Assembly symmetry: D2
Homo-oligomer: 379 residues x 4
Amino acid sequence: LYRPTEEHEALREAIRSVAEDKIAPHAADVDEQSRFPQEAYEALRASDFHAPHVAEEYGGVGADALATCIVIEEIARVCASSSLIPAVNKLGSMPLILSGSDEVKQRYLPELASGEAMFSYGLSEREAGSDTASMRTRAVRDGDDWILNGQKSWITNAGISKYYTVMAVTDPDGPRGRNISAFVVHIDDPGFSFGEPERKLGIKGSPTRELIFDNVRIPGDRLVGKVGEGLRTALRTLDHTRVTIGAQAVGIAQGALDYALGYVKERKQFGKAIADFQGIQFMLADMAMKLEAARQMVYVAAAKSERDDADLSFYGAAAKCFASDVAMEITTDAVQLLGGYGYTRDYPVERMMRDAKITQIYEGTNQIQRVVMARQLLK
Amino acid sequence: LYRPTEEHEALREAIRSVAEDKIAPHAADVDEQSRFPQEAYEALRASDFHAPHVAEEYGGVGADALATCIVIEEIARVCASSSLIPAVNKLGSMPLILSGSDEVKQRYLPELASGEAMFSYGLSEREAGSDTASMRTRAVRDGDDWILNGQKSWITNAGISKYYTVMAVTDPDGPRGRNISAFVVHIDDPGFSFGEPERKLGIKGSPTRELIFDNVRIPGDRLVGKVGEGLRTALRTLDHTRVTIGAQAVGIAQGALDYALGYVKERKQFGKAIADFQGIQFMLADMAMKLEAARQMVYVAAAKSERDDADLSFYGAAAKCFASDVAMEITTDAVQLLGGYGYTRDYPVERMMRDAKITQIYEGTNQIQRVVMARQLLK
Amino acid sequence: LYRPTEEHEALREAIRSVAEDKIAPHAADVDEQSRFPQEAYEALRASDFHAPHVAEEYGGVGADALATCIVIEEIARVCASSSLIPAVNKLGSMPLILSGSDEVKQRYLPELASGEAMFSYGLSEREAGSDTASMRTRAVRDGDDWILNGQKSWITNAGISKYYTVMAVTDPDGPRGRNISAFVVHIDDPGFSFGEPERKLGIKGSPTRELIFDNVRIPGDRLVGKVGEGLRTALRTLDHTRVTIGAQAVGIAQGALDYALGYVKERFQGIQFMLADMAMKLEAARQMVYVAAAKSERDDADLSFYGAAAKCFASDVAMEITTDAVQLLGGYGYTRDYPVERMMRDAKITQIYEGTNQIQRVVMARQLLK
Amino acid sequence: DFDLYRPTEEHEALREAIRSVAEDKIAPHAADVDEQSRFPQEAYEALRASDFHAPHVAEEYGGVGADALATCIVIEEIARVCASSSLIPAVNKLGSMPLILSGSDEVKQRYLPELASGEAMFSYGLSEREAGSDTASMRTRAVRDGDDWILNGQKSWITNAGISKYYTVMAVTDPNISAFVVHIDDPGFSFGEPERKLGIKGSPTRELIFDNVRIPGDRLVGKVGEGLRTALRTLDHTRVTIGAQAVGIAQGALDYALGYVKERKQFGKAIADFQGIQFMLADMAMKLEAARQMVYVAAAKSERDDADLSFYGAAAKCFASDVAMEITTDAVQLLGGYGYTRDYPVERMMRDAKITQIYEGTNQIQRVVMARQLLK
């Protein structure tokens, strides 16, 4: 009751030690250079932790939603950019799971579950970032095939994901929400290009790239879901990926709190370990307490996500909004807690603050989460 | 997972229905003339919700600790004062459960479980509230009986509860925290008097009285647990009722967010429903998100209060501190959202605000909670 | 420079003694029985702080807006209900000052300034509370007079004020906000009655009653500036009384923190940090109110913004501080035996009346995106 | 017409002055300053050309002698566009305060003209590895070698170091402490490796290491053994400059935020027609302006050196810094994905803001000073 199965905890100790071993040192370096955490990718893949959400049918680990966030958490605790790997894979493969045809699922999800390829997910566009219902990217038919044209931006793991679940308008004059569909674009696919990797505040490692569609023709079997169903797919994909982002935020903050506690037990200003100043003790109390509320809520919403509960819209958004807020609130405090040392790149709290910010921004800025929560409350 | 069981959800639905009609309408009156929730206690007892935690063995409903919290929540949601009936009942009976001898337990718990008698719990002392190992209340052993002297303060439901698990030193030189034992005082015991009931900011209904012991002869069977081990028992009980006060805070806040939501959809300023202004929407979003986190952590800590988990103290402190703090923010916003109306007692939210304040204060002020947490963090 | 003139501080020691000595002990009762701060009113009157804003021209104290705010603060420091007397007097006289012809100013301001009469201000309406530009209290001209029919609500200090600058729409047609004018209704004036005093969370002392107008025959000399300007005048006065509500909040917070600090001396670093946050927020709120108050007196361009900005922040701060004040005093802080309970309840309203901090944030936003 | 609670008209002329100096000369370089972690040299050149390298220096010594509001306003209006660039007047006042507050007319004369002219920059060595905040327990020793002194030890966290010219470092004489202008060229005086910082990446934060640095006896600043009464004063007076730094960073962030939200449209309406973004900008502007005004009250209070200058100083830095963080965070939030990228400054202003909360007495230390000034 109100706890992960102890199974989840064995899973956690696993992914935790994978994170402590193969991710952490590489996290500091990943961030500095803003290059992909490849070591993280081969270590997650080597431990079959790269995309544990995939079903058993395709060779996945079959992770529970709570189990899936646990992985994303335990990674973000040490490296936010790497933490995106199973998180972006769940995000980009979710339209393919929740609505994909059996043939398309069997095509694509086994290569992920195996580790051949990572997914990215192209929904946002620069002239309609949060207003995903009124996008510009275009899927016109051409024979059996599909021509995509247009813009996707803020696409995570771009350049590295092989597969890109794009959402493009199929019938530009139908009832909003029924004119958009999802198509798995490959890196192969001619005319599909990437934009410059963005110069990011945090997640500097995991590339956030614009991806351009210049008459990208693609077979008909890469339609995922039916036609027009792309927004009804994207909504349930948000519904489920919000909680992954919540867990990522919880994780970023957890790593920050861990360095905070360690540093306060080691260092001694005014003769004593700063850990024992009641001020700092209050600060750690708020950090730990907020973090634990955010954790429990992302976990509740994950329970809401595998059980596919009714109010998953609300709690998912809320868990994402709060966890991210908490992450900022905590990681900033963590930086504050290490004083001068904290704003040094030698210690991870700096990176962790820079990293936590996107949890408040990307996958729908928490203002959108508040819009969603409000619309859900007025029912 | 992260589900109150269908058992609990039905239980929730039950106690909610009892709160709505049988308790809520009286809530304004209970608070106003600062009177005990007689209607509420009556209705809870007739419905087995007055102290549902009590063991089956002694005729209680055998309520899960989570379920107990759920009841205190749903009661508090409409009337905070009334929720102390099950809350202070769990508080006062818990030392009698956690350490009580089979006999004394079977003496008192039936009286409670049926609804004949109420419990209060005397541990804190006017002088050194948080340094409980240094309490002045002594019980001197005299024959089989004891003679009590001392000063419990801040003791909720006094004057109205009949049996009082008071904690007294039984060694002015015995060892710290092992020099104290627990005694069930009756409302009948000579020399046992109450102070004038405190004039409280909120929870005005439930009486907060001083406890005076003037050479109170109490029989020898009133000892619960060993002599000396009462402190360990008291600290464990603290760990467990922390979470029920947390649930109460969540409840007070839930009432605020409910009445606010209602008032917001219907009432109109500038001619569209004020819930159309995205600002009020953000505010309501934050209220709901904070509140839901506070709720989920109250529930997690309730689970840990059943399993007697290690970090039960930490998670309970966190649940109380967060639920209460969050409640304060929310009920304050609740007053805000109803504007001029919310400032009047015609609407309850103002009362709910006064009530959230005490949850930040009694049952271990959130500062003390933050200390407890910071202490578990610095293991 | 960036400090009260030494005579503002001379004014502070004066009203501080008046508040600590004459207002403070009764404040607890003022709140307890939810009755008017009579002791406070007669003592503020005895000390010329019941309405020090009035020009000396009418026998007032001639206080600059900064001074008015400081008075309101030193009163709110001990009694918010009491702190509203000078505050609601400046509020109710402000339309009467800012635009009234010297006729009505000379008829009203001396009787206020001296302390015969208190003012309240009828702008807020239940139906169109936040949208004051679309209010529904009607006043049609009957010969030289006007007739009033309508319903002002949440009129603070309403039960006891004599003179009431109530603002009514005179011409429904035309641009709402340019069709509103203000007229001072008397307590004895025929047909004008009050509702039942609101049972309030805090400031219970200062009575807020509805104002109902049942065909009140008001003379034509009750005109407060040219017909139709009333909304121009009303947002003009809000511009100034925002800053006084800020000052009130600063005071309420101050009192909360004062009992907090005192209590902390009486009975570790965590509580120190909490007190530091309290005091620091408080002082930012105080300086923000004073910057704005000086900004009002010189009738600066951005008084719209700063009055809002100070009104919101001070009030917000008051709320956390008074809340935190209650927190520091622990169980004792949750009792009416100590005033911090009353002070928290008092501070809440500062976020609400005279434009909810939602409206304050909107007007602020508005000036930001001009 | 009464100028109470408002910065004087001359301060305001100075403001559009320094604002134009920043917009027109500093602003374009801020992005590069942060990206490369290099000293804002162009900014220093235009500040020196415009009497802003340390305008606080007296007119007796050739500065403009600007009052604490004036110097603060410069630090703000500069930080408004580049935090690192704002450290120029800020770190110069920081390093010059011991030399002013207790320095002998000879020692004032040896150095303050080189600053006021714009030749040399000053930095200030008080904090250390072991006892930064506990100034009573440091371990950098000044031994009286003849009339002269031998210095050994390590100051840490020293802004503009390696690049600044004169270093008023403070050492214990008898284990208590005195202040000494160590020169860059002085024998054996070296710097540690510069920190790779979260923000203020332009302004170098370096260790100060001494292996038997001999410095003449006239390098003494103030009283021998009694620099400590000078050190708490330098704090008292310089918090407000770090605060104004915070206000400036914060104001800049709010400026880019407003610009973006008016320029950008979303869901078909401008993103600032959404009341959520509106309240958000309102909270930002009011916190911001409150922190600004308290910075100004504390600056005036550092001018006439009031009794409570400690509290009002600490609070203004602690609040302005905290508010700056709070604002820049929302600023990054407001520009969405665009705000997350370094192509827009809101991100840099956030990192710049995270330090105003930390250095030169972390707001936790600021709160301690406030709590002690409260129980007076």
